[PDB]
Amino acid sequence: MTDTEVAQITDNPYKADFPILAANPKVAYLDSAATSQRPRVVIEAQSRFYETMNANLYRWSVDATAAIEDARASIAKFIGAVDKNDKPESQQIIFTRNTSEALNLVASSLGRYALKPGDDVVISIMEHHSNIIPWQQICKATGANLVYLRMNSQYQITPEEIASKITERAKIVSVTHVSNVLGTRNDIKAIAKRTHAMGAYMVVDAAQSAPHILVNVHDLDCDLLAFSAHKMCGPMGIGVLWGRAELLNAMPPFLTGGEMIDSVTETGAVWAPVPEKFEAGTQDAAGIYATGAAIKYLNGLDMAKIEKREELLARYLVQQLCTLDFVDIVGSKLGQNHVGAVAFNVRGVHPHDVSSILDMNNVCIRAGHHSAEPLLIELHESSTCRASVAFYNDKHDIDQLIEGLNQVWKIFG
Amino acid sequence: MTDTEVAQITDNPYKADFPILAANPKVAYLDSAATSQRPRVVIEAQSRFYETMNALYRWSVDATAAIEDARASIAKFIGAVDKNDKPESQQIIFTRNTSEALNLVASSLGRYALKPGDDVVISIMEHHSNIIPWQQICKATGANLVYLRMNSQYQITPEEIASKITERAKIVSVTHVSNVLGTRNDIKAIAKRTHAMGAYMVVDAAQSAPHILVNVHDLDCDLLAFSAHKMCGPMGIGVLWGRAELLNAMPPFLTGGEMIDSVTETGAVWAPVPEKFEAGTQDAAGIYATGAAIKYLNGLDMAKIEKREELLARYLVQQLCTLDFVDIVGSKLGQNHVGAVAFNVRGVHPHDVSSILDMNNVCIRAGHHSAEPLLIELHESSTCRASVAFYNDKHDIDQLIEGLNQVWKIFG
């Protein structure tokens, strides 16, 4: 890393936007892969909704409706879901609680729609649990087979592995865009091309890519894409599912009840149009509003500027972890091959000990399986530490982790 | 109504706790049956969580402790306490809303208990979220969807209860309070017949939890669901309570992270209840603010809240009855309304009534109120609905009555 690159991450022009970070200047929060800290403008936007337009034809409900629709449009534009006139395709944005529910919705609705016995559902060994178990469940129910894309020695899914596992039997392919443990960026567009050539649907878990890299559903050629707002400076409780307009109309509803209907009788019901077809009951309008505020915040900061800073932070994190001979990185030792997350272990020390000591030094990391236990079994690991970076981190935060790990070794080495 | 009762609802010792009402003194919000307004302390608790403990490090331990305190508060609020009065926090499951909890129950309890030929019994009063999940699970299991009907006084009689809940019944799911009629159903009595038939009792408490005392042990229900946003909590938080043995027997609903104990490539071992039913990152801040709403409601005393809202409902029905051009959809006795009063201005579409009322800063709901099978039973296509909460007052209701006269002047 050059003198200038290190200088760029020594400066921190973003940390002050976050009240919890400004109020706790000694704390080095390196667990953004789990959830983000909240920008002040996102917190006040949620409180502002509840104070000024809280409603579920009167004026408050009309404003709340307009605030929701503007948030759908902002989210659609953020992931490139725009029509030929750049008009955002807001009606292809479906709100959930998190990525987990969106993937449950997809596996249930798309699985019932498309899966026949003998079909193949292809996922990767890097998948988060929420992109595994809904497929275990629906495969057993439809008679379909669950197929796994494996990695090579460099934690990558090769084109040969893509063509070897995605065969004619494939009906659904659901792959994470970025691994929440390895930080590998998977070639989603290339996987989609093979997936479509075999007549299958492409689902993308973008929970770890939406906060860090450019997401464009049209350039990615995916049929469905899901992510969580709380991982990109939005509030908790809001997940997003984008869907190809024709596919969402064919897909059957997931949750049923109020607000997803057009009419109901004692014995049947007629479904509402998309996206209302997939949103049952009272939605979190304030959380949706605050998510739109998060998009406007990220837009104003420039995602290209965010990505550039987060590549440098990731490289500095991997580079500085590599100077500790008692640290084994779980993944690539090349920082540029890490988006966000860097998994590692202090040799012979359980991650629970590493994390407990690091918190005594005001360092927040994640320890355990990281909801990717099949991946860890593949790599012969019971548990790992995981440090993750966001644009509001800086060089000092990483140095504080490195100094904290020397204190871990001094105690457990 | 006595002279003191009118003076009681004339004074309003609560609405100043709600920033949107204090900032808009001219607005008469009578749509609390759709959603509550937020007390200041509930809004600040949500902001406070994100500013102070948003997350084995300190912030995560604090957020874990804050979430568990909220479960305990919610369980004690609905009387879910053990034999030592300790709240049964592990029987509280968080959803987005009542709708998702009812979808969870219908899917998980239906798969666990429904056999072909079994009866699922609901009532004609049900909200759509307590209808369609039963339509769906019945079509899949070969069960029958049976309806408890009303008498001429909008009540479910003991005779109808015994007639419809028969030996073939496996699941009974009835609303505690109608979101259109305001009728309070005898949930304890329905559960008695339900359990004698060897069936499970499910309660939609979305319209009762904010108004009347809910005690899961006195109601004898097996599962109960409600929404926090209808009881001064934030949106996005729903609550499902269940008997501990029943929640263990019930299969998971959503699957994925956080609800497991271990995972392999081909299978998974589930976490214990309630984590078994909570997949992925939960809305910890909304959970925290929901506990703050419980603390706020506890400080006001439900017995005081119910007593005030009973007076407001009586005044609303009494005043609506003074208009010859208003037809109440439901009982004409105000004490038979919990919260909600549905009505129609003769010959005027509810959309017209609501448009004019908004010009007069009156907020009501117009349409089907997500209870279309009920309106079809009552030969209505659409109605207005005004609803009362403790932070309403006599002025709000009078403003509605005056606005209704402006409606008749324009469309009568």
Ligand SMILES: *Cc1c(COP(=O)(O)O)cnc(C)c1O
């Ligand atoms: C509002 C309502 C529901 C649904 O509540 P949501 O929060 O919208 O899911 C269920 N039952 C009754 C009686 C209701 O009034």
Ligand SMILES: *Cc1c(COP(=O)(O)O)cnc(C)c1O
């Ligand atoms: C965090 C994560 C999920 C689950 O996200 P939730 O918001 O907790 O539902 C899914 N996939 C990946 C890659 C993740 O990192």
